Amino acid sequence: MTTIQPFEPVDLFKTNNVNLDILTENFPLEFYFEYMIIWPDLFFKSSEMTVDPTFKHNISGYMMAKTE
Amino acid sequence: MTTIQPFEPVDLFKTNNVNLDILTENFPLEFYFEYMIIWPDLFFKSSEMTVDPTFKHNISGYMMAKTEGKTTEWHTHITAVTVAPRFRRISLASKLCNTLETMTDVMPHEVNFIDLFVKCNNQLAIKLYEKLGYSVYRRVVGYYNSAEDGYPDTLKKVDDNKDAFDMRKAMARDRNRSVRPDGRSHKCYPHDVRF
Amino acid sequence: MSDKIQEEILGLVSRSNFKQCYAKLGQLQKQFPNALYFKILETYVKFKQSPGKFDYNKLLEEPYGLKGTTITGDTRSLEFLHNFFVELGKYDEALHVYERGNFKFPSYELSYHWFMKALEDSNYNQMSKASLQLAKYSDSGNLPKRAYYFWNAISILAVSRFQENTLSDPKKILLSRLARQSLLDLKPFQNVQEIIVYCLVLDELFPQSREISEEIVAITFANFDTSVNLYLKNFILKHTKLLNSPQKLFEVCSKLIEKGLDDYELITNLIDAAYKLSKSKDEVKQWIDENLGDSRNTRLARLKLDIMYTDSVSESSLSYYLSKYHNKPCCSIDLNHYSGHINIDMLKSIMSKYDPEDKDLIHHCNILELGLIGSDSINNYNKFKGTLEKKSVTDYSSCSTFLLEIVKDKCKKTNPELKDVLLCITILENYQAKDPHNFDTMCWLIVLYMYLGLVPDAYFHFINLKIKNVQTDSLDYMIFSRFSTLFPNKQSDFYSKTFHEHNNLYDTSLANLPRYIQVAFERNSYSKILGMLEMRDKLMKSYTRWTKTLENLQFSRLCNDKRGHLLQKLHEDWRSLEMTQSVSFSDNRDFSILDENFAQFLNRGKILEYANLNEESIFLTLIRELIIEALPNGEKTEQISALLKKLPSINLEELLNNNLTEVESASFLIFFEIYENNGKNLHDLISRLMKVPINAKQNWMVSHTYLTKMATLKTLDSLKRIKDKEIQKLIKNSLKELRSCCDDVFKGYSKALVQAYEELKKDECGNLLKELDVKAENVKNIKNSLLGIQKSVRNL
Amino acid sequence: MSDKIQEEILGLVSRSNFKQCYAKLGQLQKQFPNALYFKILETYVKFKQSPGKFDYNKLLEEPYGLKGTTITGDTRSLEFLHNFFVELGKYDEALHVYERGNFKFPSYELSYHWFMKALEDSNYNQMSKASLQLAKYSDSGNLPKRAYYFWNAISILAVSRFQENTLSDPKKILLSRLARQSLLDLKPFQNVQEIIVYCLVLDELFPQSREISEEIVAITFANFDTSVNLYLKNFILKHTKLLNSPQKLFEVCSKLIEKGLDDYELITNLIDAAYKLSKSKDEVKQWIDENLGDSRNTRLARLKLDIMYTDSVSESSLSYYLSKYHNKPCCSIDLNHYSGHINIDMLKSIMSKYDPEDKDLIHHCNILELGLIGSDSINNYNKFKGTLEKKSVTDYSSCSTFLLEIVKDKCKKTNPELKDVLLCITILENYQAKDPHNFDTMCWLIVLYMYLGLVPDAYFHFINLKIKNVQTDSLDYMIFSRFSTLFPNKQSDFYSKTFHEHNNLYDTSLANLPRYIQVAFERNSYSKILGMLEMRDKLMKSYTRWTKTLENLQFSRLCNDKRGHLLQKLHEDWRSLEMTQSVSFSDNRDFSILDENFAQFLNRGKILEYANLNEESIFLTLIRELIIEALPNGEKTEQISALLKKLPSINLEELLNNNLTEVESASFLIFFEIYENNGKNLHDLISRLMKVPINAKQNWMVSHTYLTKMATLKTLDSLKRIKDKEIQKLIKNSLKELRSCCDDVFKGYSKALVQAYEELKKDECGNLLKELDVKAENVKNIKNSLLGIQKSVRNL
């Protein structure tokens, strides 16, 4: 059951089930913060309402985009 | 006489007597740092107290490993083994491998087995690894393929110059669950080695 | 958005299109009146336009200096001020702004940014203050407060090892007390990494304290109940010896030995302990054998026992060791350590009792290296050369031991004859042709060619060594020393591919270290950090790192290549060294790869004069390079003025001849005379440079003197400040002969080798060559490489 | 220069300085006779001196209002006229001066200042006009002319989304056509942001057109050759469905999945398209498995395939999903969505077939949340409580759901007994000690302590949630609802640190939003602008913002603090709300954090009665604050008369009793009677306020009823217009009576809490605590918290 939510800085602790993927890049903290500062609305996550947040990480994916 | 010492980051300046060997890989500077950072305690060097460090590097070799997997597949992986030319054929290479066994069979690691990948053509390493009680678990087809070789498309064509042996020693805790006598017949793709 | 402007303003500054910049910043300043960041930007644009017109004090010191009252919490404003102050060499002000920024606007982020910035700057003091600020505001951080106290201790640890000169005697005790107490308050320790740092704090900051050694032994011994750690092994052994407790030393070694740790350091300290415990020799010997069995150490343990218990090695312990090791390559090393206690005739008798079938190649090598029989390397090689065809292609032949013995003996001569240098080369090449992976003979072939200046064939050899990564720091000196005057070929793979690739260590890996350094602190890998701290300091100061850059500046000068970019890195590299607050160079060159006494060899063996480089020679070359940049402006710089006062307070001319070649010294003196004296004495100085003889007997000096002459005169001819006619008459006239001679020298050099070949064929050289069962190689191939080298010279 | 002059006049103007103001303005008008600015400043000084003496029509409306003939292009005169008209509530006149200024003195600068002012005032109609003038004078601008037509289109979209009530139907059609035509003339589009704005104009302003849907599908489909954009994904999926073209929907979903987008919305629309194209179930399944592999979404795609092709989920698809997800938290959420198509006995059969070792804590939580077995939460908690000791400290505990089922069941009762609430607290405190970061149990603890009026114990948990920034708008209702009457302690960190820091969102970040929206326009970040406008509107209208402001005014009366700045801010915030042309409040509170069916829980659960605030309750509280401010002058204000006319047309006492507590309603009627009727019935209303019962069974209402009476009576005792000596004696006697009963009220409540405790150790409560292995803590903590509240209340 997927809802689309803003990506918050503290969600970087909750992305290991996405980011342990061999093709997914784990950027420096500074690079995630740059996207959050410049394009706060174009950094968002898919969250699964089927997964209790307390029990495990409910982030199923994310988008990082910019306007230029 | 060989004493076993922690490998210090600066020892990479003192490993030329080890690393000019045509078969020993000088990994990127990034790569050496990774192993110490995540798994500092298993990254150690063999030192000769007989060799004066003021005049010559006393490092006779060093061991690079990682621990991986979960539950039944929790194991230590032997990534690289080298011994300075002056100290070969005197069973130092066995000692480092045995030194892992004492170090990984106990807390905090308590690994179920130790594995390593060796080229199928490396009869010298193969006989060495067999002799300490490691057994071949499977043959990894195309493990060492270059970008030009591409991904192996079929398990039927095998090349002892290009395939690697998945070589395993089961710990007593594993009850030989992770080893098999017939593993030389079992073939897999490089992507099927996952932990 | 902050970033997007910064490149654009700097990119307009870098093109000197200043005029629009103030409009754009003014447009930003109307939009953002409160952003200090843009006010700092205004100063930075200001300074770049006319440094001597903008008052550094009025615009920077009062707002931002060591007493600056204008404090901002904007990380971007602080970062830009820092980089500006560093660019001015105001390294104390550069990090002072962060301390004041963090003092006025304390936050986890700002405390973290300050720690990271101080980390880049090698300011080991500033981490210790920065680390403490994180601990207070760790509640918003991602690591437990406990980590930051260890970070402070490691920062305190870092200062004491590398920056002790920065600490007053009262401060050291205070930091020593602070480090220990902050770690005490975190007990019990959670992991082995924490225990090591506490042990590290105690051992180095409280040396020789009886209580400290007792505490470390107690905590370390208790950890060995469950786990095995080699750092705790090292800590416990040191302090238990300091405790002079034979009982505890035996207990410690026994407990560690029973765990399966075959260690000679454990065995010796076990052996040392038992004697003081009056344990019988046989009791210790059996106990070691029972727990460790037959190993290299345990057989040698019998020898150590014999010396410790009877002051002589007994025949029984030696023979038992020798029974398995007499024909192992480690044998000579093991026994030479005990040479002082071993009767040579007793050893000689045993080595002669072995069967002729067991007296293999390695057995004879041990005989040779032990000095038990006179040198018979010629006959031994001929006896054992037949092993070369049966050994693995990847296996190293011990036959090199015999051939290198010949090679060293000829090379120990203070002044090797041209025939003598070729004689070694001829011997080694046919062996390398049979032993292509033997680096021992290969390096000498490498070394011998460079002395003759025949770089291309040695480079043919270097590529097979597959030198990469850290080996470039320790091994490149054989071929990248003075490259600008040995082989100035920009199109050769030697420079374009090999030299370029070897620089990646210094240009990319060195830059990358802080990000790796950061993670280790966050990953609590503290035990490696202090060794990890060491690498960078050596790497900036690395003899190879500095030499290659300075030689490349001369090479880029000789080739008339653009040097504006090259100097900027040099100034950045110089600034990076200065911020460390300890200006020195680090000799990382591995001379031990060639010979065991090579430290003795360097000062006496002309074979390595081409590689003879010291700190003084490195420092002198830098000053020459820094001068060259100032020459077009013709002003004396405080930077040069400060450095020249750091040179030894002697008359200049002796210092040069002691660290530089005669031609380099004569060139060096010339550059000062325009800089210091506006060039009054160039007429005599140029004449002296020209008089320096270029003779066919100087080997590598043939190329070196020619190209040093070429590089100097071209630089002067390019120097638009020289207006005096008659000096200009000589400069262009001097160049004119230099181009003319370019071929006269090379033929004489080309002529000289051929007679040496004829010398080699005859007399002592040829008769050994018949004895060697090796036949002299073909002169023309050597001639072509020289005539290739000669071809390169004309095209210059 | 101007701003210092304004500050000195206005600086004087805060005091007013009428004589010195006129002397200074008279000098400035002599120096600058043509500067309209100093004449406008003189009119403002006049109005501030004696509002009712200056003819608004003659001095402002006739020269500068909607029919004004006095037009200026001076930006300072326009900004000061705007701010003056806003202060007068003349919002149409405020931006009209810029429109007239720009008509007479057209410039890029004046059009840009007008656009920026219209953005600050939320006047999207005037932003649309200003953007067309920017396009007309763009040759002196920093952006290409095309940008200002996108700014016009976004302004028209903002009017249509947020201010549709301001548009007549013919004007709506005209603006829609103008927006579409102006963007059509700019093809080809230069970037994806321009395509997004064009698609937004088409989708929102031209609903239900087939031609529009064909145009949006054509432009979006071509962009997917080169890029992947999530806005274009949403447009193409929406409009391909509206076109009812299964073929085109299949092509779109396939192309995006082949680009590597695992998206369940793509997969579901692909399945729906494939079914309509008569593709076989196995073809669609195989194509999904080949292009996306094994994911949560592809396993759930098999359930969607079973539903679309067979109306029921098969055992094979369900067993395949459950094989990886039966012990994943999301499992119950995933299957509950399909509950109408899953056979429950089949699901129970599959869930029971797993090995006892694979039936982990999660698996048992999923069984409970799926309703497959009766509630066995006590035995399930006892089976898995040993996992609390093994988890990472930072991981949240699995067993909490079992305890939250028990707490939710007890709290669903329409009137939970004091023992049932203390039982829930005792269970949750003992659990929170073992799972310290579990925010679900921490949120329930905060709400249960707040229901008891134990604000210090609620605050102890609330600080551990680390609520900051935007979360303060959605979560602060849990502890700051009615704070002026629950815990009036100004010296506590609750108010001095937490409440003050939490206001920075409204005082700093909200005030900065117009700037960030301007930079979004300038950077062409067009896709976010309408959402940034909505975010600003929601924060301006926030229930939490307005409630905190009104409660702080009441708290400042209760503490005898200065209120002039808070009242000034209330009037500025109210004018800012009136400028939106849609005076309403926005409920941004996240109630879903406590339960999913929370909306049903608010209507039934007395547990959140303290936080039960609606738009009418905020509006009535605002009217009460404005009444209290007007009381000292004794004049009826047009503002209060306009606000009272916006209330529902019911009896005022019925309206109050439906939206406020009985004591809040009685307090309102008291202030309203003084305002409307000069206090004729004030004796009976004060007597009614005193009759509102303060009983020990009322929980949070004990402090609330006491402090609302105290705040009312203290406000009356300060009111100089109450001249009747009998009424003044009544107020003082009621204050004395209320202070005298404080200790007996809080001692009565303390005795009730103690008794309810002792009941926890007995019967059903004692058995449940024993079954859970939960110790009833010491009542001492409760008693101390209530005594701290009692001391704070008694000191007023």
Coordinates of C-alpha atoms in Angstrom, one line a residue, chain C residues 472-791:
Chain C
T472 CA 55.3 4.5 -6.6
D473 CA 56.2 6.4 -3.4
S474 CA 59.0 4.0 -2.4
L475 CA 60.3 2.8 -5.8
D476 CA 59.7 5.5 -8.5
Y477 CA 62.9 7.3 -7.3
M478 CA 65.0 4.9 -9.5
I479 CA 63.6 6.4 -12.7
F480 CA 61.7 9.6 -11.8
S481 CA 64.7 11.2 -10.0
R482 CA 65.8 14.2 -12.0
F483 CA 63.8 13.0 -15.0
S484 CA 63.7 16.5 -16.5
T485 CA 67.5 16.3 -17.3
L486 CA 67.8 12.6 -17.9
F487 CA 65.0 11.9 -20.5
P488 CA 63.0 15.0 -21.6
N489 CA 60.6 13.1 -23.9
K490 CA 57.1 14.3 -23.4
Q491 CA 55.8 11.9 -26.1
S492 CA 57.4 8.8 -24.6
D493 CA 55.1 6.4 -22.6
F494 CA 57.6 6.8 -19.8
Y495 CA 56.3 10.3 -19.2
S496 CA 52.8 10.4 -20.8
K497 CA 51.6 7.1 -19.4
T498 CA 53.9 5.8 -16.6
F499 CA 54.7 9.1 -14.9
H500 CA 51.2 10.5 -15.3
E501 CA 49.6 7.3 -13.9
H502 CA 52.1 7.3 -10.9
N503 CA 50.9 10.8 -10.0
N504 CA 47.4 9.6 -9.2
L505 CA 48.6 8.6 -5.7
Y506 CA 49.5 12.3 -4.9
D507 CA 46.8 14.1 -6.9
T508 CA 43.7 11.9 -6.1
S509 CA 44.5 9.4 -3.3
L510 CA 46.2 12.0 -1.1
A511 CA 43.2 14.4 -1.5
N512 CA 40.8 11.5 -0.7
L513 CA 42.3 10.6 2.6
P514 CA 40.2 12.9 4.9
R515 CA 36.9 11.2 3.8
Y516 CA 38.4 7.8 4.7
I517 CA 39.9 9.5 7.8
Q518 CA 36.4 10.7 8.8
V519 CA 34.7 7.3 8.6
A520 CA 37.3 5.6 10.8
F521 CA 36.4 7.9 13.7
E522 CA 32.7 7.4 13.0
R523 CA 33.3 3.6 12.7
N524 CA 35.3 3.5 16.0
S525 CA 38.3 2.0 14.2
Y526 CA 40.5 4.1 16.5
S527 CA 43.3 1.5 16.8
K528 CA 44.3 2.2 13.1
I529 CA 43.8 6.0 13.1
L530 CA 47.1 6.9 14.7
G531 CA 48.9 4.9 12.2
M532 CA 46.4 6.2 9.6
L533 CA 47.3 9.7 10.8
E534 CA 50.9 9.1 10.0
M535 CA 50.5 8.3 6.3
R536 CA 49.4 11.8 5.2
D537 CA 52.1 13.6 7.0
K538 CA 54.8 11.5 5.3
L539 CA 52.9 11.7 2.0
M540 CA 52.9 15.5 1.7
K541 CA 56.6 15.4 2.9
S542 CA 57.5 12.4 0.7
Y543 CA 60.8 12.9 -1.1
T544 CA 59.2 11.4 -4.3
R545 CA 56.1 13.7 -4.1
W546 CA 58.1 16.9 -3.8
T547 CA 60.9 15.9 -6.3
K548 CA 58.5 15.0 -9.1
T549 CA 56.7 18.3 -8.9
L550 CA 59.8 20.4 -8.9
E551 CA 61.4 18.4 -11.7
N552 CA 58.2 18.7 -13.7
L553 CA 58.3 22.4 -13.3
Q554 CA 61.8 22.4 -14.8
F555 CA 60.7 19.9 -17.4
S556 CA 57.7 22.1 -18.2
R557 CA 60.2 25.0 -18.4
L558 CA 62.5 23.0 -20.7
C559 CA 59.6 22.1 -22.9
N560 CA 58.2 25.7 -22.8
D561 CA 55.0 24.2 -21.4
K562 CA 52.5 26.2 -19.4
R563 CA 53.4 26.5 -15.8
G564 CA 50.7 28.8 -14.4
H565 CA 48.7 25.7 -13.4
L566 CA 51.8 23.9 -12.2
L567 CA 52.9 26.6 -9.7
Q568 CA 49.4 27.0 -8.2
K569 CA 49.4 23.3 -7.0
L570 CA 53.0 23.8 -5.8
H571 CA 51.8 26.8 -3.7
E572 CA 48.8 24.7 -2.6
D573 CA 51.1 21.8 -1.8
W574 CA 53.4 24.3 0.1
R575 CA 50.5 25.7 2.0
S576 CA 49.2 22.2 2.8
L577 CA 52.6 21.5 4.3
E578 CA 52.8 24.8 6.2
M579 CA 49.5 24.2 8.0
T580 CA 50.9 21.1 9.5
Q581 CA 53.1 23.5 11.5
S582 CA 56.2 21.3 10.9
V583 CA 57.9 22.0 7.6
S584 CA 60.0 19.0 6.8
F585 CA 60.4 16.4 4.0
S586 CA 59.9 12.6 4.5
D587 CA 62.4 10.2 2.9
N588 CA 60.2 7.2 2.0
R589 CA 62.6 5.8 -0.6
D590 CA 63.2 2.1 -0.2
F591 CA 67.0 1.7 -0.6
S592 CA 66.9 -1.6 1.2
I593 CA 65.4 -3.3 -1.9
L594 CA 68.8 -3.4 -3.6
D595 CA 71.3 -4.2 -0.8
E596 CA 71.2 -4.8 3.0
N597 CA 74.0 -2.2 3.7
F598 CA 72.6 0.2 1.1
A599 CA 72.7 3.1 3.6
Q600 CA 76.4 2.5 3.6
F601 CA 76.3 2.1 -0.2
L602 CA 74.6 5.4 -1.0
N603 CA 77.3 7.7 0.4
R604 CA 80.1 5.8 -1.4
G605 CA 78.6 4.2 -4.5
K606 CA 78.7 6.5 -7.5
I607 CA 76.3 4.0 -9.1
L608 CA 73.5 5.8 -7.1
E609 CA 74.8 9.4 -7.3
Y610 CA 72.0 10.0 -9.8
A611 CA 69.6 9.0 -6.9
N612 CA 71.5 10.7 -4.1
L613 CA 69.0 13.3 -2.9
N614 CA 68.6 14.7 0.6
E615 CA 66.2 17.2 2.3
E616 CA 68.7 20.0 1.6
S617 CA 68.8 19.2 -2.1
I618 CA 65.0 19.0 -2.2
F619 CA 64.6 22.3 -0.2
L620 CA 67.2 24.1 -2.5
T621 CA 65.4 23.0 -5.7
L622 CA 62.1 24.4 -4.3
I623 CA 63.7 27.8 -3.6
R624 CA 65.0 27.9 -7.2
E625 CA 61.5 27.1 -8.5
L626 CA 59.8 29.7 -6.2
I627 CA 62.4 32.3 -7.4
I628 CA 61.6 31.7 -11.0
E629 CA 58.0 32.8 -10.5
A630 CA 59.0 36.0 -8.8
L631 CA 61.6 36.9 -11.4
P632 CA 59.2 38.4 -13.9
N633 CA 57.9 40.8 -11.3
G634 CA 61.3 41.5 -9.8
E635 CA 60.2 41.9 -6.2
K636 CA 61.6 40.1 -3.2
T637 CA 59.0 38.0 -1.5
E638 CA 58.6 37.5 2.2
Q639 CA 58.0 33.8 1.4
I640 CA 61.5 33.4 -0.2
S641 CA 63.0 35.7 2.4
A642 CA 61.7 33.5 5.3
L643 CA 62.9 30.3 3.6
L644 CA 66.4 31.5 2.8
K645 CA 66.8 32.3 6.5
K646 CA 65.9 28.6 7.2
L647 CA 68.9 27.4 5.1
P648 CA 72.0 26.6 7.2
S649 CA 73.8 29.8 8.3
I650 CA 76.9 29.2 6.2
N651 CA 78.3 30.7 3.0
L652 CA 75.9 29.7 0.2
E653 CA 78.4 28.2 -2.2
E654 CA 79.6 25.3 -0.1
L655 CA 76.0 24.2 0.7
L656 CA 75.1 23.8 -2.9
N657 CA 78.1 21.7 -3.8
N658 CA 77.4 19.4 -0.9
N659 CA 73.8 18.8 -2.0
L660 CA 73.6 19.5 -5.8
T661 CA 75.7 18.7 -8.8
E662 CA 78.4 21.2 -9.9
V663 CA 76.2 22.3 -12.9
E664 CA 73.1 22.6 -10.7
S665 CA 75.1 24.7 -8.2
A666 CA 76.4 27.0 -10.9
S667 CA 72.9 27.4 -12.2
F668 CA 71.5 27.9 -8.7
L669 CA 73.9 30.8 -7.9
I670 CA 72.9 32.5 -11.2
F671 CA 69.3 32.8 -10.3
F672 CA 70.0 34.5 -7.0
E673 CA 72.2 37.2 -8.7
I674 CA 69.3 38.6 -10.7
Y675 CA 66.9 38.1 -7.7
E676 CA 69.2 39.4 -4.9
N677 CA 71.6 41.7 -6.8
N678 CA 69.7 42.6 -10.0
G679 CA 72.2 40.6 -12.1
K680 CA 75.4 42.6 -11.9
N681 CA 77.6 39.4 -12.0
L682 CA 75.9 37.4 -14.8
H683 CA 78.8 38.0 -17.2
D684 CA 81.2 35.9 -15.0
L685 CA 78.5 33.5 -13.8
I686 CA 77.4 32.5 -17.3
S687 CA 81.0 32.0 -18.3
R688 CA 81.5 29.7 -15.3
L689 CA 78.4 27.6 -16.2
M690 CA 79.7 27.2 -19.8
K691 CA 83.1 26.2 -18.5
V692 CA 81.7 23.1 -16.7
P693 CA 83.2 20.2 -18.7
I694 CA 80.9 17.9 -20.6
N695 CA 83.1 14.8 -21.1
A696 CA 82.2 11.3 -22.4
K697 CA 83.3 9.7 -19.1
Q698 CA 80.5 11.3 -17.0
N699 CA 77.7 8.8 -17.9
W700 CA 74.4 10.2 -16.6
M701 CA 76.1 13.6 -16.1
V702 CA 76.4 13.9 -19.9
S703 CA 72.6 14.4 -20.3
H704 CA 72.2 16.1 -16.9
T705 CA 74.8 18.8 -17.5
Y706 CA 73.6 19.5 -21.1
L707 CA 69.9 19.7 -20.1
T708 CA 70.5 21.8 -16.9
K709 CA 72.5 24.2 -19.2
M710 CA 69.7 24.1 -21.7
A711 CA 66.9 24.7 -19.1
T712 CA 68.7 27.6 -17.4
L713 CA 69.6 29.5 -20.6
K714 CA 66.2 29.2 -22.1
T715 CA 64.6 30.5 -18.9
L716 CA 67.0 33.6 -18.9
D717 CA 66.3 34.2 -22.6
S718 CA 62.6 34.1 -21.8
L719 CA 63.1 36.6 -18.9
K720 CA 61.9 39.9 -20.2
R721 CA 63.4 41.8 -17.3
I722 CA 67.0 41.4 -18.7
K723 CA 67.5 44.7 -20.6
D724 CA 71.3 44.9 -20.6
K725 CA 72.8 44.4 -24.1
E726 CA 76.1 42.7 -23.4
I727 CA 74.6 40.1 -21.1
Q728 CA 72.0 39.4 -23.8
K729 CA 74.9 39.0 -26.3
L730 CA 76.4 36.2 -24.2
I731 CA 73.0 34.5 -23.5
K732 CA 72.0 34.0 -27.1
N733 CA 75.6 33.3 -28.1
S734 CA 75.9 30.7 -25.3
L735 CA 72.8 29.0 -26.5
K736 CA 74.2 29.0 -30.0
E737 CA 77.2 26.8 -29.1
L738 CA 74.9 24.6 -26.9
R739 CA 72.7 23.8 -29.9
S740 CA 75.8 23.2 -32.0
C741 CA 77.5 20.9 -29.5
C742 CA 74.3 18.8 -29.0
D743 CA 75.8 16.2 -31.4
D744 CA 79.5 16.5 -30.7
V745 CA 79.1 15.2 -27.2
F746 CA 76.8 12.3 -28.1
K747 CA 79.2 10.8 -30.7
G748 CA 82.0 10.9 -28.2
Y749 CA 79.7 9.2 -25.7
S750 CA 78.6 6.9 -28.4
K751 CA 82.3 6.3 -29.3
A752 CA 83.3 5.6 -25.7
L753 CA 81.0 2.5 -25.2
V754 CA 82.3 0.6 -28.2
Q755 CA 85.9 0.5 -26.8
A756 CA 84.5 -0.6 -23.4
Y757 CA 82.9 -3.5 -25.3
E758 CA 86.3 -4.3 -26.8
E759 CA 87.8 -4.0 -23.3
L760 CA 85.1 -6.5 -22.1
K761 CA 85.9 -9.0 -24.7
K762 CA 89.6 -9.1 -23.7
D763 CA 91.7 -9.6 -20.5
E764 CA 90.1 -10.2 -17.1
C765 CA 86.6 -9.3 -18.5
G766 CA 86.7 -11.7 -21.5
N767 CA 88.2 -14.6 -19.6
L768 CA 85.5 -14.5 -17.0
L769 CA 83.0 -14.1 -19.9
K770 CA 84.4 -17.4 -21.3
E771 CA 84.2 -18.7 -17.7
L772 CA 80.7 -17.2 -17.3
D773 CA 79.5 -19.4 -20.2
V774 CA 77.9 -16.1 -21.4
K775 CA 78.8 -14.2 -24.6
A776 CA 78.9 -10.4 -24.9
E777 CA 75.7 -8.9 -26.2
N778 CA 75.4 -6.7 -29.4
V779 CA 76.7 -3.1 -29.2
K780 CA 74.4 -1.7 -31.9
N781 CA 71.2 -2.2 -29.8
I782 CA 72.8 -0.2 -27.0
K783 CA 74.0 2.3 -29.6
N784 CA 70.5 2.8 -31.0
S785 CA 69.0 3.6 -27.6
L786 CA 71.8 6.1 -27.1
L787 CA 71.2 7.3 -30.7
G788 CA 67.6 7.4 -29.8
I789 CA 68.5 9.5 -26.8
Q790 CA 70.7 11.6 -29.1
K791 CA 67.8 12.0 -31.4

